[PDB]
Amino acid sequence: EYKLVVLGSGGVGKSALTVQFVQGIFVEKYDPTIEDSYRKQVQCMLEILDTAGTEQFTAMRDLYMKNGQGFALVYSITAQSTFNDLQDLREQILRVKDTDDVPMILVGNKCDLEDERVVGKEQGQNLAFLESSAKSKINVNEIFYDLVRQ
Amino acid sequence: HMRMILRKPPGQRTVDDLEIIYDELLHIKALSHLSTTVKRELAGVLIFESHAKGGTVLFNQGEEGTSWYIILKGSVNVVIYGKGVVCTLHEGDDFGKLALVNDAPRAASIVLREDNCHFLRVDKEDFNRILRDVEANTVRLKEHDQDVLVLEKVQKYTVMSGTPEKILEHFLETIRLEPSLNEATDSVLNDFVMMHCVFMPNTQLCPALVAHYHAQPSQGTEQERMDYALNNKRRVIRLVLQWAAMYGDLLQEDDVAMAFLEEFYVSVSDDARMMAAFKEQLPELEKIVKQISRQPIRGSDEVLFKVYCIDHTYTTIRVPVAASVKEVISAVADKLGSGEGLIIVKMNSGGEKVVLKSNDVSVFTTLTINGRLFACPREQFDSLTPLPEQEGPTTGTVGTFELMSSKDLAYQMTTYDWELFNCVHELELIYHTFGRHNFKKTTANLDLFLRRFNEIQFWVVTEVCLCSQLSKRVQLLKKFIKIAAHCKEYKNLNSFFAIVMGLSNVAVSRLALTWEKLPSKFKKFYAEFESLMDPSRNHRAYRLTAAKLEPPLIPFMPLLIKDMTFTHEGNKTFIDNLVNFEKMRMIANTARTVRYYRSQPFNHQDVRSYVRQLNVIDNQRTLSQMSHRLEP
Numbered sequence: 006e007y008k009l010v011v012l013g014s015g016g017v018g019k020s021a022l023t024v025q026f027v028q029g030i031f032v033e034k035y036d037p038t039i040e041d042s043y044r045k046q047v048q049c050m051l052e053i054l055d056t057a058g059t060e061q062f063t064a065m066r067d068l069y070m071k072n073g074q075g076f077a078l079v080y081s082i083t084a085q086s087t088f089n090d091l092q093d094l095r096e097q098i099l100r101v102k103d104t105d106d107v108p109m110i111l112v113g114n115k116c117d118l119e120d121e122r123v124v125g126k127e128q129g130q131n132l133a134f135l136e137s138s139a140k141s142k143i144n145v146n147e148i149f150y151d152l153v154r155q
Numbered sequence: 156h157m158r159m160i161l162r163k164p165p166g167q168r169t170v171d172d173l174e175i176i177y178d179e180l181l182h183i184k185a186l187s188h189l190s191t192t193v194k195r196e197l198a199g200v201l202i203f204e205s206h207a208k209g210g211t212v213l214f215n216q217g218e219e220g221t222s223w224y225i226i227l228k229g230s231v232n233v234v235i236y237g238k239g240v241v242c243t244l245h246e247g248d249d250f251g252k253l254a255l256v257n258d259a260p261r262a263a264s265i266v267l268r269e270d271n272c273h274f275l276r277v278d279k280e281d282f283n284r285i286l287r288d289v290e291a292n293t294v295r296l297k298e299h300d301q302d303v304l305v306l307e308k309v310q311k312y313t314v315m316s317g318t319p320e321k322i323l324e325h326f327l328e329t330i331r332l333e334p335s336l337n338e339a340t341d342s343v344l345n346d347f348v349m350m351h352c353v354f355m356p357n358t359q360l361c362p363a364l365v366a367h368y369h370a371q372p373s374q375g376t377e378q379e380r381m382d383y384a385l386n387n388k389r390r391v392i393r394l395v396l397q398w399a400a401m402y403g404d405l406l407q408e409d410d411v412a413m414a415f416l417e418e419f420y421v422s423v424s425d426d427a428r429m430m431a432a433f434k435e436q437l438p439e440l441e442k443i444v445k446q447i448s449r450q451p452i453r454g455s456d457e458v459l460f461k462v463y464c465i466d467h468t469y470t471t472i473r474v475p476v477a478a479s480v481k482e483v484i485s486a487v488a489d490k491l492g493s494g495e496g497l498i499i500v501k502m503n504s505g506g507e508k509v510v511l512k513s514n515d516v517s518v519f520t521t522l523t524i525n526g527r528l529f530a531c532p533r534e535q536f537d538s539l540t541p542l543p544e545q546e547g548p549t550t551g552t553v554g555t556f557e558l559m560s561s562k563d564l565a566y567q568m569t570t571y572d573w574e575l576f577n578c579v580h581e582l583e584l585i586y587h588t589f590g591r592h593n594f595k596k597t598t599a600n601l602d603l604f605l606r607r608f609n610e611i612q613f614w615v616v617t618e619v620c621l622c623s624q625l626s627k628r629v630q631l632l633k634k635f636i637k638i639a640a641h642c643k644e645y646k647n648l649n650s651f652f653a654i655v656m657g658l659s660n661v662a663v664s665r666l667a668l669t670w671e672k673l674p675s676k677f678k679k680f681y682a683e684f685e686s687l688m689d690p691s692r693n694h695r696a697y698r699l700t701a702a703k704l705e706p707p708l709i710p711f712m713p714l715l716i717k718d719m720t721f722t723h724e725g726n727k728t729f730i731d732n733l734v735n736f737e738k739m740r741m742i743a744n745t746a747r748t749v750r751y752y753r754s755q756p757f758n759h760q761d762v763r764s765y766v767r768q769l770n771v772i773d774n775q776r777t778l779s780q781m782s783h784r785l786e787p
């Protein structure tokens with residue numbers, strides 16, 4: 006049993022990544038109201054806890070952080086804001102957990118569209134790092150492999 | 156010879172007749188995907204039909220389906236009233252299955268295209284025992300060599316995808332006016348009636364409804380034609396009544412929908428006069444028309460909203476609730492007489508700023524609890540700083556609510572929560588999920604209710620952190636655990652979870668000296684409350700708790716919004732340019748869930764006044780700092 010958490014600002018692609026991982030968009034319909042909606046099997050069982058849609062309720066984020074074991078800090082390369090917002094979430098994880106270090110990975114979603122890219126590639130490497138894309142299936146699974154290793 | 160054999164009644168065919176037919180059924184395309192067992196049964200059931208003259212009607216639209224057909228020679232036209240020959244089937248093709256399986260009227264007429272056409276036929280009782288649960292073939296309805304409606308066994312065939320026009324057409328034709336099937340009919344129409352704004356807005360639906368209302372049949376004797384036209388008009392009215400009920404008071408926000416309805420009532424009452432019809436439906440239609448010409452907030456309601464300047468002076472603008480950010484800028488630049496390129500930013504008590512898009516609608520209620528709205532040129536963005544007003548109270552209110560009954564507080568909370576929850580219209584959940592700007596409608600009522608969760612949560616945190624006396628702070632934690640328990644008893648699970656989440660807040664869970672000396676009974680009371688929030692197996696703990704309860708209950712709102720979000724984001728609205736109606740049903744089901752929770756009603760003025768006028772700190776930094784100097 007494993008509990009991974011996906012974090013980041015709205016419009017960053019959190020929900021797209023989560024569905025793309027557990028099941029896949031279009032190929033199957035997605036029902037988020039049944040038991041196995043966020044649980045996949047990879048050789049172990051993962052449950053993805055995503056703060057998508059619930060960004061305004063920061064008590065939801067904290068509950069997921071508390072129950073989490075791995076953390077995906079997703080930013081969008083389309084917007085500058087979204088990378089900055091990762092500073093606070095990085096801190097907030099440590100505060101709820103009460104630990105020195107926690108297994109986490111940085112993610113730079115929306116890497117497929119590069120005629121709108123306003124974020125550099127090495128900025129994330131200074132702060133595990135991947136430059137993923139949900140709608141182009143790039144690195145989607147790789148993200149959640151990292152966290153089980155750590 | 157084969158003709159004669161295939162023309163004999165089912166129970167008059169010899170063993171050698173049956174044996175010759177079967178050997179020929181193996182060449183037939185339409186039957187290829189069937190088993191030996193099935194083909195042998197069909198051998199003693201398939202009837203040979205022949206018609207000589209083109210233009211001969213095989214069956215008419217609106218009739219009850221009695222047969223399934225396979226074309227051996229020739230071709231037929233699929234004809235629909237008000238559209239004519241919509242597509243044409245050839246030798247090898249089959250038709251008429253949909254009406255048989257769905258026990259529904261014929262959606263179209265089948266007319267012989269050419270002379271001398273040969274058919275194989277299977278009648279309804281024979282079709283149902285032999286073929287019904289073997290023929291899984293997706294029913295595709297075609298117009299202009301294009302899929303226009305797709306149906307599947309999800310037993311009936313349900314709409315999977317299709318054009319907005321054909322989906323409406325389908326849901327019109329299948330309405331049953333038979334009075335004992337009242338709630339069954341309303342339930343079927345409910346998916347479309349609620350979801351139409353996503354794929355077929357009123358600007359399209361209303362003309363399409365009028366066009367359908369006046370659609371006359373293009374075939375049959377005078378009586379046949381009059382009977383069909385009358386029931387068509389009865390079905391259109393039925394759908395209009397469901398459409399008008401769904402909206403209710405929201406119609407006032409749509410001019411096209413109101414113009415339509417006002418004209419439609421005139422059109423119906425005139426038809427009622429001279430045809431002597433619609434005896435029951437006309438008073439229903441009149442009741443709804445006359446009603447046109449905490450309380451729910453309307454999008455046309457007027458707001459006096461303060462929009463702040465960098466120096467913390469402000470303009471009071473007077474605009475509609477559903478006004479766009481662009482309309483807000485225009486109203487501010489009016490009173491400040493400017494053309495200096497204003498942008499609207501919303502800001503936290505924490506100082507966190509967000510630039511709002513020009514086409515964002517109804518932003519006034521999308522503010523955080525202590526959020527304010529600002530107008531400035533872009534070069535001022537980074538120099539903006541919060542107002543003192545935003546930083547919340549500095550002394551607590553324990554000396555007031557501590558004197559109040561835990562039971563009284565919980566009850567008054569749920570009364571207020573219910574008024575707020577009933578202001579939320581079913582469609583506001585739709586607008587919120589698919590995006591406010593696409594509908595240009597307000598979700599003000601939903602926004603204010605969702606805000607209440609954050610308010611209650613932060614109310615807990617505020618009162619604890621402004622309570623310096625450790626002895627009385629333990630009495631606080633005890634009282635909040637009590638209020639939560641009572642809230643959970645009234646089935647107000649929203650306020651319940653909000654208090655529990657307030658108690659688990661980083662600033663509150665820190666206070667070990669407060670938690671340690673809390674009575675052991677309440678320590679376990681809270682640990683049970685905190686295990687109901689367990690996000691395991693898709694919040695299984697909560698989901699089962701909520702399911703066991705009975706209708707009059709307030710759900711855990713953030714999870715409902717989460718469900719809605721992932722339903723939208725994980726499913727595509729359009730599939731091959733056809734409306735993914737499978738997705739529409741899912742969103743509708745989640746909304747009907749809210750309808751179920753409010754299907755039953757609910758069962759100390761100073762306590763009412765406190766609960767409704769909360770003063771909260773929503774600045775987590777400030778709340779941590781206060782907590783750090785209560786217990787370092």
Ligand SMILES: Nc1ncnc2c1nc(SCc1ccccc1)n2[C@@H]1O[C@@H]2CO[P@](=O)(S)O[C@H]2[C@H]1O
Pocket residue numbers: 210212214215234235236237238239240264265266373374
């Ligand atoms: N069973 C049927 N259902 C619906 N429409 C039928 C129809 N049969 C016809 S053909 C008319 C005819 C001509 C000469 C002799 C006998 C019959 N039609 C005609 O085909 C037209 C196709 O376009 P519409 O504007 S729906 O009008 C239709 C009828 O006039």
Ligand SMILES: Nc1ncnc2c1nc(SCc1ccccc1)n2[C@@H]1O[C@@H]2CO[P@](=O)(S)O[C@H]2[C@H]1O
Pocket residue numbers: 220233235241242243244248249250251252253254255260261262263264265295296297298303
């Ligand atoms: N747009 C449409 N509206 C209504 N009916 C349509 C229809 N299109 C069709 S045929 C589609 C087709 C399938 C295979 C090959 C070519 C065309 N049909 C066929 O005509 C029958 C009219 O009566 P039903 O029992 S509702 O079954 C219908 C279909 O088999």
